[PDB]
């Protein structure tokens, strides 16, 4: 029998299908099952506090007016251009900053109608979602991104969103991030929005991401270590080499200050302290203490033999004193941020 | 009774509803009640003097031609696609730089019509609003952002805007800004625009924002303090160490100049002085004075025993003189900017 | 009488109003009166040589076919959606780089038709207009921005543009620019474009803008003064302190070179000299001369008592010689750029 | 015979051509032959890991309902505006980040229909495709870009994509890249996507690109060599010139650290080591070793004649020892990255 | 006679004008005459290798079906909104990267039809055209921009493009570029594109541009000269001032390296050498040679009277030797790049 006729017969003016009316206009709410597939995931920025994702969005619901029985086939595909004659839910993303469709050669849409009236709807989207970040423990941190899917114009009495019982969130094979690691377990929960206009449905996804130490360890931690050792070099120089020792101290202090200033080049202007700030503060304290030690020795040496060995004893003590205290500080610093990071994400 | 018929019966050619005519074509003006809900608020930039906001906008007005009495239901929802057949006010934002709608899956719109003719209209918007800023007292300042809602084509005789008596401006729970604090009280007032073309209605919202000292105190104030103390270190060096003392002074002065230059990296090119400028000027004065003190001592010492103790007395006085004057300056500077900031915002 | 009927009666197929024909198809040209209102004005960039403006554009012309006499009202407002059925002039901006409309809630348009046939048309626009700049006398300069309004498809025989006799250009109250001052007098003149295709009408607006010295005086002039004085400090040091004096000279010269390089960070790569370039060249000459003076003294002192006082006399002369010549240069430099800037803008 | 009639006769309501139905609605799948022509290729960025391409896309398939026999001509061209009445495949690019059409004067489209029903379809596109990169061996690396062409709404039972047997990928004459070399052989293979919704067809293209050493050899490798030689210069200085030798060492170490930091200015924050990182680490080790050598000599020399020649022997050994070890390191480093790069790309 | 009727009479369904058919469907090809007018020209970038232009594009061709004889007027203007009913050629730009129309108040289009059937078509466009650049002889170079105009869907048998015999390319009066000079003579030639789909027509324009030395001479050449002279200053210092001479040499070498690195801030990463690279290499060689000369003198002086005058003779020779060789190098360098630039552009 001719396939062209049934397309308008099912849902035209002859049938009386009005796309502006819910499948059950007076009765129980419409239950919608949601499902996403993460195609691409990246472009995480701390300055603007957002990330970009590319997904396929799947929806399923039942419309009794779309049932058919005269074909022998159980399921049949449709055309993207005829989506304007079918009622569809008004899903939208709450934490969105910007989004757009894809129309590279045709409309990237999929529609499928079953015998009993089940509808499968799949579209391709790209999103710029906002994600607040807690930058305490900055180089060693875990973040939790959020994705919200809620209705806009339909109250809880009409639309109710749900998650598919099995496999709600799927990730494409081989997906990797240059800077983060994406965990394999996801948290699924519920919203409920209350406004002046009423009660609205919402569902939520949580992704856990861990930062990598490979880049930061090369970039920030090692050069400060080299500056500290370079400052320590001055303890073996003759005490009479005043221009040499003073120049070494001043250069080390200024370089440490510039490095500490440059450590916050690509971060938002937050108002609390961080791990990298503590590390740079301790390094500044060490180099400043070395320069003050030389200043004290230089002042002591010119008090005119009992004043000669007094100056030498300070250098002898300092040579074995500074690295030991630095080692103790390193031990405590690295232990406390591996017992504090050990706390559960949830 | 069939729900499909009344949709066109109420407002089609049969009823004679013309969307190009006001609800009361000849008579009292149309009174519109406005209401906003702040979903997101951020991206404040001093260079371009603007900020970005994401809001829901609610409007309410009475249209006598839209009254119905045959349904038993008190209120009934509509479809977003039929908003083209209803008269709507021409609200727009005066201080806008750019704005756009949202159509991520459907049109983010809401429409609701009551029995007596009341209309509720809700849309989702994102805005880039302009906000002039007074950068005097730059690190310790309070700013007042402005949002204006005015008509464009209708004179005061036709449209009059008003605020809802209770709860005009609402803020989403947990909304925070990385750099500012948003006050909980808002100022609501009136406009009245006069042009060559006539008299137009306007309403205004004011938000008060306070800056945070956490970032700036780490970034700018502390390093200058360290540079000043580093310059003070030179007073304990032997007066014969001319290359050491001169190198220390030159390095400190050049570093202070570079820091002062870098303190205005992300600010508009204003033509008045600021608190941070005063602080950097005083620091430059201090380091320059220290270097001039050493120059004076070096010139005095070579005038050939009465000239020997004269040079030593200057160093002895300076060692206890410089920090005391710096402390007095700090006390006055921090007091005056906490009694001047104490002034009321209004 | 019913207001809905006359809307189509005046300008539909019944009346025979064809929007593709001029009001006087064969006869005298159509005279159009123009009027603008500057809502916002800013974003001036020297690198790209353009500025951004937000204006209301008003036009007035007479159409005999739109006359009505049956209403008692003298003037009546219209709807923005019906502008597609009225003939409108094809105005466009010649020096435009980019422009767009505004449709934030509705179309920001205004239409008004009088009894005799007068039409008032008002729209809201944002513009990115190009403005060539003469960067000679860069920190102390006056610029003249241009706005051109010309036709595209209608020859001089059909459309003629004119300015309103009183109040053609109006500025919103309280409008300020962070860097410039906008003069209160505007220049209005005529164009006439000649191409291969014919003769076209044009009108022009000129805005005069003056730069502010507050930012540049802090940013560039004062640090160079401090570097020059820092170089002068070396004349009081002992002549035997070769590492100290040479290090001071080298540091001052390198810092001056870096400052001169950084003085052109945000300017187009023009091929002529400017005031700031002259100032930096003179500062470089001064510091280089100081270092050469020390080199000459150091070479003279080791020619082995008649050679001892010869070296001291050079320092004694230089100490009082350098600041005096610098003061004379400052006097001439500041006088010549306040008698040359005194020239009339026109 | 009139050419206008057949245009609608072939594919209008009279013929009964429904564009929403496949050429063979029930039967074997539609076989589509693909072909591309690379017009422009560039804008490769490592930070965002993507590249931009401009191509012509050709498709060929057979539609039995479009056969004609009454013209004598074998093939006839069409108009771009009538592409809305012909069934076309829903091709799209999987690894796309953004794409758009071209409509500069008309729609850049081509359509051609043969006597037997063959269809040729050509469009112009620009693409921003994502390409993961392995930055190990960073200055000397080969990358493999990927282009995927897959269906969205049609299962494997309906659409099957194939490559043209001869000349699938063509490159415009004279196409060059500033930084890379494009190989003349391309790899063509198959996809097969499996989702929850079914089985979909895909085809793939691989491009091999090689980096050029000309820029990096000037930018990074040579300055580090000069810094190493500059550090070596210190071995010929008198051992008593403590300020000179220490200043030389400190300046060289700080400059090497700054260069190593600046070597990663435009690269993603990866977490593994690279060739340039190894080179900078070795250079830092060399300069640090030179400074430690001077520190050891300075400490040894002041142990008070047997201690005098001991210090001189260290300098004599070091002068001929450092360049030899550096040469051996250079030989091994350059050999291992020309035997490891010798590995086949596939 | 009524002007409204003939507008549809000439080209509607009554006349049978089909816009999808060429003026001569079976016969000689359509000859199109092209003409451009350059309104704005700028935004030349070496990094992305493109430039932006704003032009008017004129086309002329003959359509026999559009002839009229009943008006007395020889030529008559039309409306922009009726361009959808006239056949127009499918011109497009081959080397385009991006383009867009202008619709600031109306569509910026012009149409004019003559008695015999001649059509004049004028539109306003902005273009971002790609231009490969040869950066050899970088500060002193001449570039040749290209503009290509070719068909897309019509074979050589149907459309043939031609240039107007007189005045094909016109430039607006007073057009200037900040960095380049535009020559007054243009090169006009032919294309012929061969693809798999057939033979297509093309025409080409060439613009010759010369760079200006004013900016680069101030920015790069002079500071390197000052650094070289600063290095030469060291030859007059006492040979015993080891810290002073070594510090001067190290500072000069490091500053030269930083300047050479900064000379390529805004250039693509090409793999060949340039004039500025040669200049910086020679400057680095000079400063390194000066430092090696001091190292040799310092090593020679401590070989213990015959060794004393040997060290002094080296300084005496070097003082008159270095500037002479530098002058010879400058003479050859400036001669060879003014006899090589003397080569004809074609
Ligand atoms: C959508 O899901 C809800 C929740 O399961 C359904 O509501 C239930 O419906 C059953 C059958 O009528 C009742 O026995 C329950 O009491 C209902 N529970 C609640 C909380 O309402 C609803 O029927 C579903 N909608 C449709 C159209 O099937
Ligand atoms: C809109 O609000 C205004 C202000 O309240 C109303 O104007 C008043 O109307 C009442 C009732 O007719 C009069 O008694 C007052 O004198 C009016 N005041 C003014 C200042 O005009 C107006 O009627 C309202 N519009 C509608 C449609 O209800
Ligand atoms: C538009 O303005 C022009 C200029 O004033 C008008 O042209 C004049 O018209 C008067 C009345 O017919 C003549 O006496 C003058 O000789 C005309 N001058 C010129 C230079 O043409 C023109 O009539 C106006 N157009 C309309 C429709 O009123
Ligand atoms: C599309 O190509 C496939 C693969 O060649 C065709 O499938 C074959 O068709 C022939 C002829 O009917 C059969 O003998 C083969 O057994 C088929 N092979 C497979 C794997 O199905 C298919 O017929 C082609 N489609 C059309 C419309 O020609
Ligand atoms: C377009 O221009 C071509 C080139 O001049 C014309 O082709 C010539 O036409 C004349 C007149 O019929 C012939 O005598 C020549 O032999 C043709 N030359 C070629 C190379 O074909 C063509 O006729 C023009 N088209 C139209 C419609 O006038």
Numbering used by the authors:
A (entry chain C), B (entry chain D), C (entry chain E), D (entry chain B), E (entry chain A): 8 to 311, 386 to 427
Structure paper excerpt:
Glycine receptors (GlyRs) are pentameric ligand-gated ion channels (pLGICs) and are permeable to chloride ions, inhibiting the cells on which they are expressed via hyperpolarization or shunting inhibition. The subtype GlyRα3 expressed in nociceptive sensory neurons of the spinal dorsal horn is a key regulator of physiological pain perception. To understand the mechanism of two such endogenous modulators, Zn2+ and protons, we have used cryo–electron microscopy to determine structures of full-length human GlyRα3 in various functional states.
GlyRα3 experiences substantial inhibition at acidic pH when activated with submaximal concentrations of glycine but is less affected at saturating concentrations of glycine.
